[PDB]
Amino acid sequence: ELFVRPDVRGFLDFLNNLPGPKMHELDAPTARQMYVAMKDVGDPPVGELGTLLDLSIPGPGGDIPARLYDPRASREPGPAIVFFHGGGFVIGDLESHGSFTAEMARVLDLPVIAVDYRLAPEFPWPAAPDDCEAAARWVANSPAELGRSVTSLVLCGDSAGGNLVIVTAAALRDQPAKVPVIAQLPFYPATDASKEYPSYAEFAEGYLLTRDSMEWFMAAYKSEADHIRSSPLLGDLAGMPPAVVVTGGLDPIRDQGRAYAAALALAGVPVVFREAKGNIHGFITLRKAIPSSVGDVMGAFAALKDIIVEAEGDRAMAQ
């Protein structure tokens, strides 16, 4: 009932065995080595798409690089997913999450725009949420160069990218884009860059994760909050879009995704809360290393598909 999946144990062993630069092996985590290691073992290939296209989105600090993923070359008007990557083991960009965004596009049969928002410390807050909001409003306008007619937005993101989902949804709630946000899907969201990581002894499942693995997740959280800066949404959640919130059972910050789901329910916002029992923080980009993550991701995508179908059915009824 308290457990670690066997593929999860293997990944945690792989993390503990990662040597350092020939400079000094010891306890070694050069971002360069992490980048090589995670690119190699983490996720499946991007694979085949009808559309895989670089975009340039006009933004308040210059052009925002983005990328369109679509199983189809062309399609009827419908929703578009806008994706905000999180970070941790790697800083994160279009390449780190590209296999996930391609697979999301295939399973939901919808176009996915992934956003390469400005990172800290090069670009202070509020560059990251400004870019995410600019990108959502641009997609919502159905720009000629996108080659898609967009009738609604779905926002998706992982870890601190999850908080970029929450803050962008709240911004478009307060000042709507051309079309509405009809669903949010934050994966294991990190909802407060101000909040200190739990210590080993404060996590009830610490004994299952082990101190050495928990140190990895702590380091990832700290690095992520350094690079991906957004404000906690501590105010009223009334009028936020219907949600799928997914946590990791072995994630020391599972309480952050749980509390967001709980606050949505208390405000009367529909929410599907799921927890990946015996899986870790960061699983959506670990679908090769930890194949049991596929089931976790597919369960989230099925819930999101139900919200989208119901949301479009309720709009066809109202009109």
Added chain:
Amino acid sequence: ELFVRPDVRGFLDFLNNLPGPKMHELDAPTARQMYVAMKDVGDPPVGELGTLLDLSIPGPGGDIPARLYDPRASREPGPAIVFFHGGGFVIGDLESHGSFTAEMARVLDLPVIAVDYRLAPEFPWPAAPDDCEAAARWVANSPAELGRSVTSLVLCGDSAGGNLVIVTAAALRDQPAKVPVIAQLPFYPATDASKEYPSYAEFAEGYLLTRDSMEWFMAAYKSEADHIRSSPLLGDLAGMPPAVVVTGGLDPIRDQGRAYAAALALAGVPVVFREAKGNIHGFITLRKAIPSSVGDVMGAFAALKDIIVEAEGDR
């Protein structure tokens, strides 16, 4: 959903046109006319079933009347739904909720056992939850009197019957029955009868509902609380079965269902929280008077089906 649905506004005008609450209560003849009115306008007919069978369940206060609904005359082994009715606009029995339990059995394609648990003031607390637990344990043993073998339980109930779902799921969590409870579906649960009904002032949608309508829901809630009694589930919710929790947008006690869904999420229990925007307390037996309630119920049934499918994949 547009603050008050047109069909809901029509039902509230219908309610205002009946003889209504006096000194914050429904007296005996007012309630009597309301019950005939609700029987005449509320729900569609029971309709066609492959099985519609009366049952007698042994319980700690005598026999417990129950009724099996099933579209199929005969079926492979599978989950069984146990249903614990609520009340308020109806007294609550096998007849008042029969159309709902029949439609639940058809849509899910599963047997539903509705339970006629002992009521107060004749049988005081804890007869109701005792009967509900006994009935669930009985169904779990796959008794010969059902023509059906049971691999798992699903618990479902409305209003004070929603709290019988919660208390019963907790009892079977602590001391398992022969098969597990794989899902819970409380509709607009009343989770703490000892709490005061919200005032017109305290309910944020009071102005949409109107004072006269609010007095009706308050009187109907008091009438239900007299008949159907269980105490709040007090401890840790960890280990509780995966849930679909449905509230009413115009229901003064929506905070109770919202808070239950929120407490499940905090404990790491998977939960689908849904709120029927612009619909009222008691909609699951108002599918004829308020046809828009069909969409609310089918949405809850679709989410419940996803839980059952995932529960049986995993096993």
